[PDB]
Amino acid sequence: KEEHVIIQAEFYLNPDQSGEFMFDFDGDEIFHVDMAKKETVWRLEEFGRFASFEAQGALANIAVDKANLEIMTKRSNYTPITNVPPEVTVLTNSPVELREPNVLICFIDKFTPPVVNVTWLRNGKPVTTGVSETVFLPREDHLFRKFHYLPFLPSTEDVYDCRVEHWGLDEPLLKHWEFD
Amino acid sequence: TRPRFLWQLKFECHFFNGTERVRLLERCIYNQEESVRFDSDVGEYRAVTELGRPDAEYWNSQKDLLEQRRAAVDTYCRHNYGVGESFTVQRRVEPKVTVYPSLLVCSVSGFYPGSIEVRWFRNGQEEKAGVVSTGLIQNGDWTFQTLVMLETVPRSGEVYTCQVEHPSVTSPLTVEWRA
Amino acid sequence: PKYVKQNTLKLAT
Amino acid sequence: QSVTQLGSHVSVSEGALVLLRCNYSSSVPPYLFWYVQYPNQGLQLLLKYTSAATLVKGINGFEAEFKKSETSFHLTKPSAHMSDAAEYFCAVSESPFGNEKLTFGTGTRLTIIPNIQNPDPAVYQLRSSDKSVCLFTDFDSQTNVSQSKDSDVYITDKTVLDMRSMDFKSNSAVAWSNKSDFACANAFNNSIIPEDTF
Amino acid sequence: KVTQSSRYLVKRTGEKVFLECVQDMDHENMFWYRQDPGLGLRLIYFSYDVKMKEKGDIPEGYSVSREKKERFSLILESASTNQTSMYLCASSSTGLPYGYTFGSGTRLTVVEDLNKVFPPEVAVFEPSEAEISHTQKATLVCLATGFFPDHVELSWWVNGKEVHSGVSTDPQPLKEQPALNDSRYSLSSRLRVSATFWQNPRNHFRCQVQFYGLSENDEWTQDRAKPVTQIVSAEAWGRA
Ligand SMILES: *[C@@H]1O[C@H](CO)[C@@H](O)[C@H](O)[C@H]1NC(C)=O
Ligand SMILES: *[C@@H]1O[C@H](CO)[C@@H](O)[C@H](O)[C@H]1NC(C)=O
Q1: Among residues E37, E100, E31, which one has the least CA distance to residue E72?
Q2: What are the distances in angstroms from CA B17 to CA B20, B71, B93?
């Protein structure tokens, strides 16, 4: 008889020296901590008007996760993680209407480790203006989720592709979208 | 490239009916395989795989550690629930509804939370046969969307209506389409 | 209000 | 988060009630600690409030009650012992175990006053140095040794010494100068018993 | 154990001072506090991991460094006298069921002129025969004088064994010239024994003062002996 779930999720990956810390509420990121600027980044600004979180505290957990990863690596006798490729999907925020601002969403799901290269391509060429993404989000099977966004003006003349690179794929993955 | 090693830690607070029932689950995951966990309904750490036994044995041997964890349901879970209640458990964004041909498509987007009910009608009669949904889609920005299609060859004098029921609205939304 | 984190525990050595 | 320790210096007669104040500011679930610094050593955790219980029993006979309503965590002991003389520090943290940053209060120095059993004030003279030293001792705990008149006459503050094996305690103050006109008959001016010997 | 290199330090103004703190428990967290009368312990800086610096509640005037996990160094760019204090270092781990482990602490006094540093002179004054006759107890008094800075540890030794019972040392020195900013100090202490004990010529009493002054590295060119850390004592024997 389930109702709600709050998850504090953190990870540390090795060669990369990459770690993340975030809170989740029923699948959505409440906030995550940026290790570099040592700050709490709220998913929606409004949230940061009604709540706070001591970021330093996350830096502390990560330091311990660093030490734990090393201990576990040795305990498992340097057994590498097994790659699991992403499942990619591209869709828009709402129904598309020419001349009406919309947003392309590239959804990367069910993959690990937490390392991906994501490039938006408009008619073959890279697009970066306005783009944004989320941190690697939690999954119940412990794989990850990730979202990339591209605000855009629909047109009969433009084509879009979401390019995803992951150590689990043999070759880059291109997901296509176009006004029907 | 070269070998990767991953360490994941999850603290899951499960709430049932507000905070009348709360279950805390601490999970340690090495390379995607959970090795040891503390389940508030068990009361102590347990190994999930043989790799986690050392940790279960070690942590369970420290009276203070177990003490804090058993009270985390209150000092951690119930506390954080109250902190985001106003913008999480109570967040409400109404669905934008639009209907268009393709198949009759009822697009319900930008809504929160996720539980929604979409129904199709023909001349006042509910069409429960020949409906198709791509399921609830999480946009990852605290909004959902869904598409509920009706297999029909649109005809004249006929009225098609999409009815949407959602927590954000008092009286169901309806968008009708005719030809 | 302020969110509270849960401290990670160091593994057995 | 913050803590306040009202009363930086607290005097208590032995056998009497010891109460060291501690109030806190926490916008989150509080974890409080009481540390003690006995003479010539480092800080020792006396007790800590980990939210397990509300009345925390500590070492060396101390007790502390967490009052969420008064926002306090005062330290008490029914009978002050001479070995309780030390500095006491209150601390607050956001960590359930006190392993992340700790915020300390201003601290309180606790002085225990001895119940002088057989008072009998006196000023004795004693004999490489050039100073002559006078000893004002065995007076009562109600006697306050004042500073000096001549900038050339040094008078220490009163202090207590505990002769354990004998179960004897005594108060004393020392004065000295290299001044020719400096005798023990006048060294101490300022409210000494009309009863002390010479 | 969390070890702090030095226990006492005398440094000159405008100089760059280094206070070290080394821990061997593989602790991820380390902190630097200063302890001052009426101010308790105040957080200067702290680190939750390698290369992690976080300003505490009173960062001004200090800098810090944590290149290795075991070491957290506190730095004073240009030492000012207001920085004369006792620095405590603490370490701990967020991954441990317990808290702080404190270090020995290091007394640091920063003065403008090093030529103001002086060792103490120590002298023991024997019991009054009048007191012996009147109370059957004998009070020896020890006077440590002319020292600066206030870096001393006075102790009594009876028959080669350090004694604590019967002793009362002043909680603090007193300035020989109150108004002066560079004033030498004087400290007194008592040791009270039974008359019998003092009338025994076999018993030996020694008042010992350890003075912490300039170090081997400090430069010195004044005629008098360099004011280095040293032990100064005075003694007396029982007398009938
Ligand atoms: C690691 O190696 C040791 C000895 O080679 C072996 O006994 C142990 O079972 C190994 N552990 C794992 C994780 O396979
Ligand atoms: C991602 O791209 C970088 C160069 O931009 C490359 O070095 C790296 O190997 C790529 N990673 C993956 C998952 O292919």
Answers
A1: E31
A2: 6, 19, 22
Pick the CATH number of B91-179 from 3.40.50.880, 2.60.40.10, 2.30.30.140, 3.40.1190.20: 2.60.40.10
Take atom 11 of ligand 1 and give the residue whose Cα is closest: A76
Same-domain status, D3 and D97: yes
Packing angle of the helix pair B53-60, B63-70 (nearest 10 deg): 90
Dist. CA A66–CA B7, nearest whole Å: 8
Hey, of C4, C5, C10, C11, which one would you mutate to test binding to chain E, going by the most E CBs within 10 A of its CB?
C10
Q: Residue D4 is part of which domain span?
A: 1-114
Strand pairing partners for E10? E109
**Which is it for strands E8-12 and E106-111: parallel, antiparallel or unpaired?**
parallel
CA-CA distance, D17 to D81, in Å (whole number)? 10
Instruction: Please check whether residues D102 and D131 belong to one and the same domain.
Output: no
Separation of CA A161 and ligand 2 centre (Å): 18
Given the structure tokens 């967290």, which residue do they identify?
A: E29
Q: Report whether CATH 3.10.320.10 matches the domain A2-80.
A: yes
Tell me how far the alpha carbon of residue A76 lies from the centroid of ligand 1, in angstroms. Answer: 7
E213: which residues sit within 8 A by CB, 6+ positions away? Answer: E10, E117, E119, E151, E227, E228, E229, E230
B177 marked ligand binding residue:
no
For residue A35, what are the CA distances in angstroms to A113, A121, A134? 19, 29, 15
Residue D117, SS3?
Answer: coil
C2 touches chain D (CB under 8 A): yes
Q: Are E190 and D126 in contact (CB under 8 A)?
A: no
* Per-window interface: E 41-100 vs B, CB < 8 A: 97-98
Q: Is B166 annotated as a binding residue?
A: no
Report resolution (Å) to 1 decimal.
2.6
Residue range B1-90 in CATH 3.40.50.300: no
How far is the CA of E230 from the CAs of D146, D169, E14, E73, in angstroms? 33, 33, 26, 27
* DSSP 8-class letter at D82: G
Please indicate if the annotation marks B55 as binding a ligand: yes
CA B129 to chain centroid, in Å, comes to 27
Nearest bound ligand to CA A76? 1
